[PDB]
């Protein structure tokens, strides 16, 4: 299983090669998105923004081997073929294009939608029924609505994470520009994202138990019937996903409090004492200049006590 999948990978030579160029190309193709001719017009604007025909059919071909790009041959069409994007082209394109989704309103709406889907799934899990009653009433809205919305909340987190890392980097370069100047700013960016990271986690825990509880009624109802292994495996996996989410969501907070604390400390030590940043610059000058006139610090160093053997 665990080594074996890796054995599955090198078997199909799945490789995704997207240096700055192919990538910029995919992003363009995504900006207009169609057909093969259009695809080649695109590859024109791209090759040009930097042998067009052959490098274009080359690009296109390693697009369809790597399953970035699905293809259907349509003769009715300019070039005699048409090209959509596979889920993969989409995810990759999405990442660099899609706007941030940070809105507590959005997470509110999503959790409401899951509340419903889950509740219904449960009522209908405990009201019994044929195979149909379960694949339609329980199983679908779990596999199809609920777990997908969970993966969407999981995304909202892992995006939120990348926003953190941005704010860290912003604070870095802001102190690196304006030194004791940039304090107010780095104290906004710091107390703002400690606010966001609070609400997103208040909501999750708030609607956290309700969801779990209903996930349970269902699990509960699975208990009486022996045919329902699929609804069992799913409800478990589903519970896990919710935990993994609330855990990490509580945890990103403790890590961000670490960060925040230690940035107040930087301010108190590194800046509050050298307010014009002078000391540092002069430190540098003294680091390159050292060997012109060297000197060494002195330190108390006692004679060790000699013992025997």
């Amino acid at each position: 299983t665990v080594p074996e999948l890796v054995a599955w990978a090198r078997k199909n030579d799945f490789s995704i090669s997207l240096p700055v160029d192919r990538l910029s190309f995919l992003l363009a193709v995504a900006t207009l998105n169609m057909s093969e001719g259009e695809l080649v017009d695109a590859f024109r604007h791209v090759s040009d923004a930097f042998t067009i025909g052959v490098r274009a059919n080359n690009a296109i071909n390693d697009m369809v081997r790597q399953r970035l790009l699905n293809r259907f041959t349509s003769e009715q069409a300019e070039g005699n073929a048409i090209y959509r994007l596979t889920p993969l082209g989409i995810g990759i394109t999405d990442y660099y294009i899609r706007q941030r989704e940070f809105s507590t309103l959005r997470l509110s709406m999503q959790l409401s939608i899951v509340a419903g889907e889950l509740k219904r799934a449960a009522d209908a899990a405990e009201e019994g029924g044929d195979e149909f009653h379960w694949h339609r009433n329980v199983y679908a809205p779990l596999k199809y609505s609920v777990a997908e919305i969970f993966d969407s909340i999981d995304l909202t987190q892992r995006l939120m994470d990348e926003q953190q890392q941005q704010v860290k980097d912003d604070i870095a370069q802001l102190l690196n520009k304006d030194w004791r100047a940039a304090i107010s700013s780095c104290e906004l960016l710091l107390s703002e994202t400690s606010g966001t990271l609070r609400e997103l986690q208040d909501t999750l825990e708030a609607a956290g138990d309700k969801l779990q509880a209903n996930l349970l009624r269902i699990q509960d109802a699975t208990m009486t019937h022996d045919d329902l292994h699929f609804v069992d495996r799913l409800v478990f996996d589903l519970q896990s996903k919710l935990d993994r989410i609330i855990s990490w969501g509580q945890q990103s907070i403790d890590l961000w409090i670490g960060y925040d604390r230690h940035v107040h400390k930087f301010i108190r030590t590194a800046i509050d004492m050298d307010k014009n940043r002078v000391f540092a610059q002069r430190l540098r000058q003294s680091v390159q200049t050292y060997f012109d006139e060297p000197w060494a610090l002195t330190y108390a160093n006692a004679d060790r006590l000699l013992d025997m053997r």
Partner: protein
């Protein structure tokens, strides 16, 4: 003997701290028990040490150390130029925004990198081996030596390691001492002739 001095010599802290102090350990806010101790009993601990011909100093940045004197009873030693580079840098890191993502923790590498950046890779080598050019083996001795001088600067209380290994560490206000020559905005020569007179440094 004054009451408070004696009361100081009695705190359970003293013998060990005193030992450290006499082996050249600088004492930063990072040891609350100790730093606090010195804060409390300073004015007397000062005398106590003066009797050994050594001054007990609180750097402007708040840390304490022993600065042996012209006449000292406790032998005095000096740091190697290499240690001094390692240190100056260490103070730079202490003062850079690099740290801020790092949450205070730096690496054997981060140090070594910033070092060959800011220093003269060439003369910096001429320390390790008196004449060697571009060598590779000689670029390991520069690393090992640079590890050694980072270890030593740990004894001294400049830098706390992290965990069971030597790979990641962090930095005490104590390093600011590597910046003495420049702390006072001044011709570095003047201020060096100054520190040489006051026992802070020695020429090489």
């Amino acid at each position: 003997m004054p009451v408070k001095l004696a009361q100081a010599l009695a705190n359970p802290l003293f013998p060990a701290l005193d030992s450290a102090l006499r082996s050249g350990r600088h004492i930063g806010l990072d040891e609350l028990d100790n730093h606090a101790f010195l804060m409390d009993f300073q004015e007397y601990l000062e005398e106590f040490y003066a009797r050994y011909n050594v001054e007990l100093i609180r750097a402007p940045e708040g840390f304490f150390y022993l600065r042996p004197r012209s006449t000292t009873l406790i032998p005095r030693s000096v740091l190697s130029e290499l240690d001094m580079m390692v240190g100056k840098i260490l103070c730079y890191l202490y003062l850079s925004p690099e740290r801020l993502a790092n949450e205070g923790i730096f690496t054997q590498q981060e140090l070594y990198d910033e070092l060959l950046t800011l220093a003269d890779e060439a003369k910096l080598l001429k320390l390790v081996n008196n004449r060697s050019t571009g060598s590779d083996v000689d670029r390991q001795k520069l690393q090992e030596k640079v590890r050694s001088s980072l270890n030593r600067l740990r004894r001294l209380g400049m830098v706390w390691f992290m965990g069971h290994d030597s790979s990641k560490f962090r930095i005490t206000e104590s390093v600011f001492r590597f910046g003495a020559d420049v702390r006072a905005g001044d011709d570095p020569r003047e201020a060096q002739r100054r520190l040489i007179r006051d026992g802070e440094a020695m020429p090489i």
